[PDB]
Design a protein around this ligand. Structure first.
Ligand SMILES: O=P(O)(O)OC[C@H]1O[C@H](OP(=O)(O)OP(=O)(O)O)[C@H](O)[C@@H]1O
Ligand SMILES: O=P(O)(O)OC[C@H]1O[C@H](OP(=O)(O)OP(=O)(O)O)[C@H](O)[C@@H]1O
Ligand SMILES: O=P(O)(O)OC[C@H]1O[C@H](OP(=O)(O)OP(=O)(O)O)[C@H](O)[C@@H]1O
Ligand SMILES: O=P(O)(O)OC[C@H]1O[C@H](OP(=O)(O)OP(=O)(O)O)[C@H](O)[C@@H]1O
Ligand SMILES: [Mg+2]
Ligand SMILES: [Mg+2]
Ligand SMILES: [Mg+2]
Ligand SMILES: [Mg+2]
Lengths: 171, 171, 176, 176
């Protein structure tokens, strides 16, 4: 397991920001990959003062492919676009998103993820660290605990406490 | 020139409807290709009692490719989809739309257009008549008149009358 | 009884709206098509006045078997920022005016420069006259784009191409 | 002065909201994230309570140089039908409450089964208490997700990693 603190997450986000500036790529539009790239997109936005954020509803059931459910954006024609996600695992998600954004004829599509898995089909133009361990983000920790309560995350006892009551009241 | 009356347009729409029913394809979702496939989608909808219509904002500047500006839809997963447009010229537009809908993982994507140009790259699964003449639809007649007032359409004099005043008041 | 405007009348309706818009010097930056009856009106007006920017709102007034509501229900809003823009809301008929009002309120929250409404037809009991309209009518209107919906719920209305429709409708009812 | 909640406090805030939601037996069908400050709150609550359906509204209260408005402005609404659903509106702070109210009104027009509001923090002068909240505060709140926006407009606020930010910000100001 790799279980980044928010402090690490912040450093991941600073790194991306530093790389984007160093390489001269200041996006006009951030495309958040819902829902995991939600927090990364908002943090990068605030860091680099990027005021335009759009969103794509896509999920990779683990279905054989990622499935787009909704694309929340206005015209992207002639704009500098950065696709933001939290991790590139197989890389299917970043590929599918990049393929569909391109159809909006932007000036440029680049990709950022916080973390990379070694076996990714697609390597983000910008990332923080490549990890061969199982990553547990602060925003999917409970989904991971619901699938294995033996995962060593903090505040689990407060969570198990609430989840128990939750399980009772909606069956 | 081919300048279909609404009566012809209605027959074009009945034909598509007849073909869809005869072939057993009753869509769950109509995707209107904005803005030319707008009236065709609404007429087919009413004809076949299809209550679910979604929309895609795409235009082919005549830019080298059609450009998607917006996709107005919720999940299409496992649904029977019909893409509706008014004409397939080069076929670029129907291809681009069909490519992006597929990413929503529907059950099936089929295409309908009212009219086909002989040189289309993509042939709609359903169409009314193939025309090698320049088609002037009832809903783009004035765009055509603004580009050549010598086109033999009806009510042109009423239109030239209004267009003249229009040209004055917004420069 | 019923009003059944020809396509020729709808063109005249659209023309009249365009003529009134130019006469009032209100040329919209953005057309807001009220889905789905406002679809054809909005497209034709777009072509008439060379208005290239059309946006859409999915709103429905449920008045039928089982599913029935007292007010229109918005189901989706299809638009980018309307901020500082002259907006014209386009629909086919204002009946009670509940739909135009609902759409006007929701569009106002986008802070446009101005919101105006246009509907082709109007009923005497509409709770507000649209800023632009072709004809006030007191019959129930069957449009070219909802005729088969009316025939389905009322087989004996006098419409063109009925037998042709009935045959298609027959084959639709059986494929169940 | 300023309130600057740690990430640890935001987790506790989210937890408190979740705990209150379960205690009230109000488990939302749909989360409505108020963009953009409500983004992180909505995602974390989604994970906490296993709520899989998140929708979004692009709304902004312009309170800055040149561009300034008296009320929030909606710029886009990102949702399918909310009809018959239990909806929870999630935001980071209710200040005047003008935003929560605007979002509540617009969501109501989708005819949900119910609309409830949650904001992590609350000011004593809010025109309405959200149905769910972590803490009433009277300082101006600097969140983890808008800290650099505050530093930019106010260089002398006491935030972590300031020098690192200033160096990046410096290189941003020059690439003009
Ligand atoms: O490279 P891949 O193999 O495609 O993996 C990457 C994607 O998988 C996860 O998303 P997910 O489909 O789980 O949805 P979520 O973001 O809502 O959690 C993750 O957030 C990435 O978006
Ligand atoms: O097969 P193609 O060569 O791509 O031509 C087909 C498309 O071209 C037209 O759309 P257009 O781009 O003009 O936009 P519009 O529908 O708004 O008129 C037409 O309505 C079709 O959608
Ligand atoms: O003035 P009102 O009393 O509100 O009625 C007018 C509305 O009713 C119809 O819409 P409908 O809700 O039936 O949906 P539709 O446009 O898809 O036919 C019509 O298109 C108007 O929008
Ligand atoms: O109660 P109010 O007086 O209406 O203020 C509260 C709102 O202000 C902030 O949003 P903002 O409009 O600044 O946009 P943002 O979420 O993108 O930061 C904040 O996120 C709340 O949404
Ligand atoms: Mg994801
Ligand atoms: Mg077209
Ligand atoms: Mg209507
Ligand atoms: Mg906000």
């Amino acid at each position: 397991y790799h279980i980044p603190s928010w402090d690490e997450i912040e450093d991941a986000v600073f790194s991306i920001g530093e790389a984007l500036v160093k390489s001269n790529y200041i996006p006009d539009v951030l495309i958040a990959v819902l829902t995991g790239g939600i927090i990364p997109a908002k943090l990068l936005s605030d860091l680099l003062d990027l005021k335009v954020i759009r969103y794509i509803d896509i999920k990779f059931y683990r279905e054989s492919k990622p499935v787009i459910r909704s694309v929340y954006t206005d015209s992207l024609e002639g704009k500098k676009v950065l696709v933001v996600d939290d991790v590139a695992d197989t890389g299917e998600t970043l590929e599918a998103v990049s393929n569909v954004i391109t159809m909006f004829n932007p000036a440029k599509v680049m990709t950022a993820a916080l973390y990379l898995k070694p076996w990714s089909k697609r390597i983000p133009d910008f990332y923080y660290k490549q990890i061969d361990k199982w990553i547990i983000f602060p925003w999917d920790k409970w989904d991971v605990v619901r699938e294995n309560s033996n995962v060593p995350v903090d505040k689990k006892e407060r969570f198990l406490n609430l989840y128990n009551q939750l399980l009772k009241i909606r069956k």
